[PDB]
Amino acid sequence: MKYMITSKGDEKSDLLRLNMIAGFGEYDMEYDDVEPEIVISIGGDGTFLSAFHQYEERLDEIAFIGIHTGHLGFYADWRPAEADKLVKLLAKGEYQKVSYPLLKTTVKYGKEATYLALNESTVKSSGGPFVVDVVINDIHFERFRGDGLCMSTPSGTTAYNKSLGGALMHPSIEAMQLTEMASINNRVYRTIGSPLVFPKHHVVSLQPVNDKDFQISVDHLSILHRDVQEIRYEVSAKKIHFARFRSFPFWRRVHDSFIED
Amino acid sequence: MKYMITSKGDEKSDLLRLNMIAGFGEYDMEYDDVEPEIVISIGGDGTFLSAFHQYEERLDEIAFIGIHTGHLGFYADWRPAEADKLVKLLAKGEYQKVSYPLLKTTVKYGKEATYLALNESTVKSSGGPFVVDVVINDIHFERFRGDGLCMSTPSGTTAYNKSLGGALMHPSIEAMQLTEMASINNRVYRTIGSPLVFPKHHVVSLQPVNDKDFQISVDHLSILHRDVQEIRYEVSAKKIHFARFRSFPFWRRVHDSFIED
Amino acid sequence: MKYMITSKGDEKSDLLRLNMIAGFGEYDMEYDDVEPEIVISIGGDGTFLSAFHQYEERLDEIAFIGIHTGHLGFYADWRPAEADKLVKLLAKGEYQKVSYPLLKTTVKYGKEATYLALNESTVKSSGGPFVVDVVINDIHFERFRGDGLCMSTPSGTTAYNKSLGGALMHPSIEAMQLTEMASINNRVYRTIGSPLVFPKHHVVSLQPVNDKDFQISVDHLSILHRDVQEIRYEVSAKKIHFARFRSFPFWRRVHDSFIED
Amino acid sequence: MKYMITSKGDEKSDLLRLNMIAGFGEYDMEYDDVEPEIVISIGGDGTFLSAFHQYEERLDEIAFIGIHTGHLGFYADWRPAEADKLVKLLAKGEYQKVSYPLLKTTVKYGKEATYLALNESTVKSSGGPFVVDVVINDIHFERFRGDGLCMSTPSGTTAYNKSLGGALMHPSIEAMQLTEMASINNRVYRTIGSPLVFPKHHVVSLQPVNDKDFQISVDHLSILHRDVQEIRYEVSAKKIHFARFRSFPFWRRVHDSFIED
Ligand SMILES: CC(=O)NCCCN(CC#Cc1nc2c(N)ncnc2n1[C@@H]1O[C@H](CO)[C@@H](O)[C@H]1O)C[C@H]1O[C@@H](n2cnc3c(N)ncnc32)[C@H](O)[C@@H]1O
Ligand SMILES: CC(=O)NCCCN(CC#Cc1nc2c(N)ncnc2n1[C@@H]1O[C@H](CO)[C@@H](O)[C@H]1O)C[C@H]1O[C@@H](n2cnc3c(N)ncnc32)[C@H](O)[C@@H]1O
Ligand SMILES: CC(=O)NCCCN(CC#Cc1nc2c(N)ncnc2n1[C@@H]1O[C@H](CO)[C@@H](O)[C@H]1O)C[C@H]1O[C@@H](n2cnc3c(N)ncnc32)[C@H](O)[C@@H]1O
Ligand SMILES: CC(=O)NCCCN(CC#Cc1nc2c(N)ncnc2n1[C@@H]1O[C@H](CO)[C@@H](O)[C@H]1O)C[C@H]1O[C@@H](n2cnc3c(N)ncnc32)[C@H](O)[C@@H]1O
């Protein structure tokens, strides 16, 4: 059907993209970057993140594919030299689709705004001290003082979450995971410390204690939100779909990225 | 129906048990510690652990209830003074049952043996160096050198898992979590470090590299296994059932145990 | 001799300060906030930090004293009700002086600027990715990618350093300690991870890899430095002096602040 | 003067040792494994540890040297191919000596026994629960419940201490560092968590709460001590001496062992 290709913009990526476009022309494959059904990303995990967000409004009508021109990525897990074999199988079809959970973030003001994260959503302070009350399903759980908090999808657990001490979880688990950034713990101030892993339908809510200005990030983009009253996290009802041509198990991707390849 | 009561054996616990037995006599409640349908545990989490294991062969035909005569427990989350109101509702019935996942451990020799964990199963060395190959769904993931490994149920994540840096996960998630004990990491030796959270049907397998003698624990009991060829972990097909009379959310139990009460 | 008193500015602190000033008047004690020999700080650790920095140019000619009107502080470790007994002993004198090491930070441009930290000096990115080469005594040790780095005095180790996983060290040790904030570690990127504790005369130097704009903090104040070529850390030749009237061991202050009081 | 050589016992090590012995014969170098002044260790850090302990009673009268026939060691930091150049300089002399602090452990009964550690001394339980009161300079600091405690020399901080989260400290710092193994922390039980770094002359003392049987290790050897009343740690008055022929800075050894080589 219809397809498009994003590129990191370096010479490798642009040239591989132009080459793939020519291969597609040799099939009944029409390039449409408006309503594609296949989105190919050429570059790294960042390039793939950008492609996801470019088309987050047609997630149900798209299967994504990642080609890494640099080191192996977690989302771009196909090698540039397999590119021709890829165009081939994309044309004849018959591939299976694989779905990863996403994270929904809602920001309320005194008005609302929602975002969808593939990696994670984080909250920090606009400079001043970061103090937030953490409420779980309307139960006040803790008062967090520190640098910030990170809420991660399953596939995001090998990203920022990992650097904060979070657990890696298999993407077939419909869950989200909360980790702390440098929490203060003394006689006066008390956080759980451990990461927290939440199931579908649980709502984690952050509420300001003094300052109501926070730097909120969603994947690679950071927005300053003024006069904030609440930040709601929950596992999204929407999912991202991957075109899969081949067995490449998550734990193998983990081993290849972190242990040895 | 039929019921039984275990006690920690201190005076508080024995006396509360004898008192509850008298209250049950005032209903059509017959004490049977052979095929009970209700198992009451009076004491702490250890006492409850012992009660689970005493009756692990009739898990489908039993609902458990925990009374803590000391500090609040995670499994024994009812207070001693609510004991009379408890006997009451146990008799009239109409309570709901709540189910937590369990962990299945298989130990192979050169013969087999399986165990069921409510908290966690751990592996350490019989003194010598602990070196094990970790295989995930038949894929060699890492060679672990260190003090040992811990595999935890969801409800076990607030126990040993927590002290090892693991994430706390809500018990409605059918999963198991692997954490490291003091792994060596240098130029030569490489582990993931992060905890790992596995879904149902995944099989984590530990295989010896030199020494084949390990100290294996399952909840509060530690068995020395000689001439071991494999230790298989997976989320069990069996589940533990709790009689629930009242809303006491897991995250509240967490907040009460660790943040403040 | 000459003395001055800073206050947090709340009613407790101002009133205690005015009361102490009256007690001093009853001795040969002259209030001079220009060249004091005794600096009293009334409030919390922040108030004390501000007092240290107000007079960092006469550190050799001053003995500091902290009064906490809130919870116990690490620098303000005297209780408000002992205030009269304090004025007493300050007048008759004969107290001993205690000295804690400080941290020297030098920032070079393309010009120079040095700062003195009592708690710690940190470095983060002006938004973009934080990538810095870490050089120890001119030997390239690691390329750090992550949120930032923290360099701590001994007395600072119970502050930000503690929240980052650093070790607590007794203030009689002339050293500084470097900790990581969320470092990325994968096949491509490699940091030591462990905190590092440096002796006197060692020079840790941070050098930019791409972006040369960093947010640099020294205790409670954060400065944006543009066109930065180097940040040099070393244990300072200058030390802070405390008037001591009483044995209050560091490890007891630690136990009281973090374990129980 | 007099010298001796230990070997790991594999063919590489034995053959290199016999070769070095022949080179020494070509000088006024007499082999004496009773009162040597130079102790050469051929193998790995374990082999070197064994050599230190073989001669711990003549530490003031010996300079140690490590040759690694496997990967680089922290104590055996000379390569096998530099062996001839080594025998050379050992004969003509004029080398400088470098000294690392050691750890003194005293075990009291109801009688006494002291040990000297180059890496670290650890304490665990004989199976039952490990509960110990930690007293610092006679001040009760904390009640530790968990798997055990580790007390490390500076040069030991890259060994077991490192795997437990401890800080790496430069060996010129006369100090010792205490780290926790899986401590329980909840409403009831409270430890500091952070590693602790102690200066010379401080005494950390462990005292039993119930069980008085512990597995105590000193470097590579583990002794079961029954009816124990106290374990005292302090920085030793004795130091280990290294023959140094060449600049090989500690932080470079760290970088080479852990970052890349
Ligand atoms: C300041 C800065 O770094 N700007 C962001 C530029 C990169 N991007 C793109 C990416 C990605 C990605 N996605 C994945 C993935 N899903 N799984 C595994 N690796 C992945 N990666 C790998 O992350 C490594 C570091 O760029 C690269 O090698 C990628 O292969 C934003 C993502 O950065 C993550 N992050 C931000 N502060 C972090 C920190 N302090 N520590 C660790 N992670 C951090 C965050 O997650 C965000 O979503
Ligand atoms: C040597 C020794 O301790 N012998 C075991 C005696 C206790 N038992 C009974 C229990 C329990 C329990 N079950 C739960 C639960 N599910 N959730 C939360 N708390 C719970 N608890 C609480 O654990 C605290 C410590 O006893 C108590 O206060 C309980 O309220 C064995 C259980 O000990 C756990 N463990 C063993 N080494 C540990 C360590 N180093 N660190 C932390 N945990 C450790 C392990 O899990 C085992 O399954
Ligand atoms: C954003 C923000 O917090 N603004 C700073 C306002 C406070 N100030 C004053 C203080 C202090 C202090 N000095 C000591 C001391 N020497 N020892 C022990 N406690 C101490 N305290 C205690 O720190 C607790 C938290 O304010 C209070 O309870 C004090 O009793 C700046 C100091 O904040 C430290 N910090 C900054 N991000 C931190 C983090 N994420 N985590 C932990 N620490 C962090 C940093 O060290 C700086 O130097
Ligand atoms: C059960 C077992 O392992 N038996 C001990 C056999 C090894 N020996 C010899 C050694 C050594 C050594 N000394 C140094 C040194 N000073 N600096 C850096 N590396 C060093 N190494 C390196 O340690 C790596 C692991 O053998 C090797 O690669 C060596 O190059 C005992 C030493 O093991 C240490 N340990 C014990 N449980 C540990 C754990 N769980 N995690 C990390 N460390 C652990 C402990 O320190 C003891 O003192």
mmCIF file of N, CA and C in Angstrom, chain B residues 45 49 52-53 75 101-105 115-124 149-164 169 175-179 181 216-223 233:
data_model
loop_
_atom_site.group_PDB
_atom_site.id
_atom_site.type_symbol
_atom_site.label_atom_id
_atom_site.label_comp_id
_atom_site.label_asym_id
_atom_site.label_seq_id
_atom_site.Cartn_x
_atom_site.Cartn_y
_atom_site.Cartn_z
ATOM 1 N N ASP B 45 4.224 -12.320 58.757
ATOM 2 C CA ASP B 45 4.321 -12.825 57.390
ATOM 3 C C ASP B 45 4.974 -14.199 57.360
ATOM 4 N N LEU B 49 3.515 -17.441 55.632
ATOM 5 C CA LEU B 49 4.306 -18.249 54.706
ATOM 6 C C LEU B 49 4.241 -19.726 55.079
ATOM 7 N N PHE B 52 0.797 -21.170 54.138
ATOM 8 C CA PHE B 52 0.729 -21.422 52.703
ATOM 9 C C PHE B 52 1.397 -22.746 52.348
ATOM 10 N N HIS B 53 2.613 -22.965 52.852
ATOM 11 C CA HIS B 53 3.354 -24.168 52.490
ATOM 12 C C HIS B 53 2.770 -25.417 53.133
ATOM 13 N N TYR B 75 0.957 -10.097 54.114
ATOM 14 C CA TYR B 75 -0.057 -11.121 53.966
ATOM 15 C C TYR B 75 -1.039 -11.125 55.131
ATOM 16 N N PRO B 101 -0.404 -14.291 41.837
ATOM 17 C CA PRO B 101 0.408 -15.278 41.121
ATOM 18 C C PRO B 101 1.468 -15.880 42.030
ATOM 19 N N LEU B 102 1.922 -17.070 41.648
ATOM 20 C CA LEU B 102 2.979 -17.777 42.351
ATOM 21 C C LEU B 102 4.115 -18.080 41.382
ATOM 22 N N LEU B 103 5.226 -18.555 41.937
ATOM 23 C CA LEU B 103 6.426 -18.862 41.174
ATOM 24 C C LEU B 103 6.700 -20.358 41.239
ATOM 25 N N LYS B 104 6.941 -20.968 40.082
ATOM 26 C CA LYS B 104 7.274 -22.382 40.000
ATOM 27 C C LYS B 104 8.770 -22.543 39.776
ATOM 28 N N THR B 105 9.407 -23.359 40.613
ATOM 29 C CA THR B 105 10.825 -23.670 40.487
ATOM 30 C C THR B 105 10.993 -25.160 40.239
ATOM 31 N N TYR B 115 9.096 -26.809 43.171
ATOM 32 C CA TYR B 115 8.632 -26.077 44.340
ATOM 33 C C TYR B 115 7.771 -24.900 43.900
ATOM 34 N N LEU B 116 6.979 -24.395 44.842
ATOM 35 C CA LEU B 116 6.069 -23.281 44.606
ATOM 36 C C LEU B 116 6.382 -22.197 45.624
ATOM 37 N N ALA B 117 6.713 -21.006 45.148
ATOM 38 C CA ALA B 117 7.080 -19.899 46.017
ATOM 39 C C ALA B 117 5.977 -18.847 46.025
ATOM 40 N N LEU B 118 5.666 -18.337 47.220
ATOM 41 C CA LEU B 118 4.803 -17.174 47.380
ATOM 42 C C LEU B 118 5.594 -15.873 47.426
ATOM 43 N N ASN B 119 6.753 -15.870 48.093
ATOM 44 C CA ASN B 119 7.657 -14.712 48.076
ATOM 45 C C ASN B 119 8.659 -14.845 46.930
ATOM 46 N N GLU B 120 9.635 -15.738 47.073
ATOM 47 C CA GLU B 120 10.700 -15.791 46.078
ATOM 48 C C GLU B 120 11.513 -17.071 46.231
ATOM 49 N N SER B 121 12.261 -17.391 45.174
ATOM 50 C CA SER B 121 13.221 -18.487 45.150
ATOM 51 C C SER B 121 14.596 -17.911 44.842
ATOM 52 N N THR B 122 15.598 -18.270 45.644
ATOM 53 C CA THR B 122 16.953 -17.762 45.453
ATOM 54 C C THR B 122 17.945 -18.907 45.286
ATOM 55 N N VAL B 123 19.087 -18.578 44.684
ATOM 56 C CA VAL B 123 20.170 -19.519 44.429
ATOM 57 C C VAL B 123 21.484 -18.871 44.846
ATOM 58 N N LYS B 124 22.274 -19.587 45.637
ATOM 59 C CA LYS B 124 23.612 -19.155 46.020
ATOM 60 C C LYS B 124 24.542 -20.360 45.926
ATOM 61 N N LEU B 149 21.292 -15.091 42.810
ATOM 62 C CA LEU B 149 20.170 -14.539 42.066
ATOM 63 C C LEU B 149 18.872 -14.763 42.840
ATOM 64 N N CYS B 150 17.904 -13.873 42.625
ATOM 65 C CA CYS B 150 16.618 -13.915 43.319
ATOM 66 C C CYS B 150 15.497 -13.777 42.302
ATOM 67 N N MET B 151 14.550 -14.712 42.326
ATOM 68 C CA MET B 151 13.372 -14.671 41.467
ATOM 69 C C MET B 151 12.127 -14.526 42.334
ATOM 70 N N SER B 152 11.329 -13.496 42.059
ATOM 71 C CA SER B 152 10.297 -13.016 42.971
ATOM 72 C C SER B 152 8.915 -13.024 42.321
ATOM 73 N N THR B 153 7.898 -13.421 43.093
ATOM 74 C CA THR B 153 6.518 -13.200 42.690
ATOM 75 C C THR B 153 6.221 -11.711 42.762
ATOM 76 N N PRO B 154 5.069 -11.280 42.250
ATOM 77 C CA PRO B 154 4.677 -9.878 42.473
ATOM 78 C C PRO B 154 4.555 -9.529 43.948
ATOM 79 N N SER B 155 3.787 -10.306 44.722
ATOM 80 C CA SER B 155 3.657 -9.998 46.143
ATOM 81 C C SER B 155 4.976 -10.158 46.885
ATOM 82 N N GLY B 156 5.915 -10.916 46.332
ATOM 83 C CA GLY B 156 7.238 -10.967 46.913
ATOM 84 C C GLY B 156 8.102 -9.749 46.660
ATOM 85 N N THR B 157 7.682 -8.821 45.791
ATOM 86 C CA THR B 157 8.600 -7.745 45.426
ATOM 87 C C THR B 157 8.863 -6.782 46.577
ATOM 88 N N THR B 158 7.997 -6.745 47.592
ATOM 89 C CA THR B 158 8.265 -5.921 48.761
ATOM 90 C C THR B 158 9.118 -6.630 49.804
ATOM 91 N N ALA B 159 9.580 -7.839 49.518
ATOM 92 C CA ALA B 159 10.352 -8.635 50.462
ATOM 93 C C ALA B 159 11.828 -8.598 50.045
ATOM 94 N N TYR B 160 12.519 -9.734 49.917
ATOM 95 C CA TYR B 160 13.935 -9.780 49.553
ATOM 96 C C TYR B 160 14.227 -8.994 48.274
ATOM 97 N N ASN B 161 13.381 -9.160 47.259
ATOM 98 C CA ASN B 161 13.533 -8.411 46.017
ATOM 99 C C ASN B 161 13.748 -6.927 46.285
ATOM 100 N N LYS B 162 12.948 -6.354 47.194
ATOM 101 C CA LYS B 162 13.058 -4.930 47.485
ATOM 102 C C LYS B 162 14.453 -4.586 47.993
ATOM 103 N N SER B 163 14.989 -5.401 48.902
ATOM 104 C CA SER B 163 16.305 -5.100 49.455
ATOM 105 C C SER B 163 17.410 -5.206 48.410
ATOM 106 N N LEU B 164 17.164 -5.878 47.292
ATOM 107 C CA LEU B 164 18.172 -6.044 46.254
ATOM 108 C C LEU B 164 18.055 -4.997 45.151
ATOM 109 N N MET B 169 5.898 -4.397 42.171
ATOM 110 C CA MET B 169 4.875 -4.503 41.138
ATOM 111 C C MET B 169 3.551 -4.975 41.717
ATOM 112 N N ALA B 175 3.578 -12.078 36.522
ATOM 113 C CA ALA B 175 4.974 -11.898 36.148
ATOM 114 C C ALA B 175 5.875 -12.385 37.278
ATOM 115 N N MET B 176 7.175 -12.431 36.978
ATOM 116 C CA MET B 176 8.226 -12.742 37.941
ATOM 117 C C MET B 176 9.407 -11.822 37.656
ATOM 118 N N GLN B 177 10.210 -11.542 38.689
ATOM 119 C CA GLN B 177 11.268 -10.540 38.589
ATOM 120 C C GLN B 177 12.581 -11.099 39.120
ATOM 121 N N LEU B 178 13.649 -10.953 38.327
ATOM 122 C CA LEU B 178 14.975 -11.467 38.649
ATOM 123 C C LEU B 178 15.888 -10.314 39.047
ATOM 124 N N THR B 179 16.551 -10.453 40.198
ATOM 125 C CA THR B 179 17.501 -9.460 40.682
ATOM 126 C C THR B 179 18.833 -10.124 40.998
ATOM 127 N N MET B 181 22.458 -10.420 43.182
ATOM 128 C CA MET B 181 23.165 -10.192 44.436
ATOM 129 C C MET B 181 24.636 -9.989 44.105
ATOM 130 N N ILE B 216 19.722 -23.607 47.484
ATOM 131 C CA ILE B 216 18.484 -23.111 46.892
ATOM 132 C C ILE B 216 17.478 -22.873 48.005
ATOM 133 N N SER B 217 16.875 -21.689 48.007
ATOM 134 C CA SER B 217 15.854 -21.341 48.977
ATOM 135 C C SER B 217 14.512 -21.162 48.282
ATOM 136 N N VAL B 218 13.453 -21.520 48.999
ATOM 137 C CA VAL B 218 12.093 -21.243 48.561
ATOM 138 C C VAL B 218 11.319 -20.676 49.740
ATOM 139 N N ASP B 219 11.109 -19.366 49.740
ATOM 140 C CA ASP B 219 10.505 -18.668 50.878
ATOM 141 C C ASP B 219 11.436 -18.896 52.070
ATOM 142 N N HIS B 220 10.950 -19.355 53.219
ATOM 143 C CA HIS B 220 11.765 -19.370 54.429
ATOM 144 C C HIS B 220 12.637 -20.617 54.574
ATOM 145 N N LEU B 221 12.735 -21.468 53.556
ATOM 146 C CA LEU B 221 13.443 -22.733 53.722
ATOM 147 C C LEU B 221 14.506 -22.916 52.647
ATOM 148 N N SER B 222 15.688 -23.368 53.068
ATOM 149 C CA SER B 222 16.873 -23.431 52.221
ATOM 150 C C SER B 222 17.361 -24.872 52.133
ATOM 151 N N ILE B 223 17.459 -25.384 50.909
ATOM 152 C CA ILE B 223 17.805 -26.773 50.630
ATOM 153 C C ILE B 223 19.126 -26.779 49.878
ATOM 154 N N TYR B 233 12.826 -21.406 36.209
ATOM 155 C CA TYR B 233 11.848 -20.501 36.800
ATOM 156 C C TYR B 233 10.790 -20.150 35.764
#
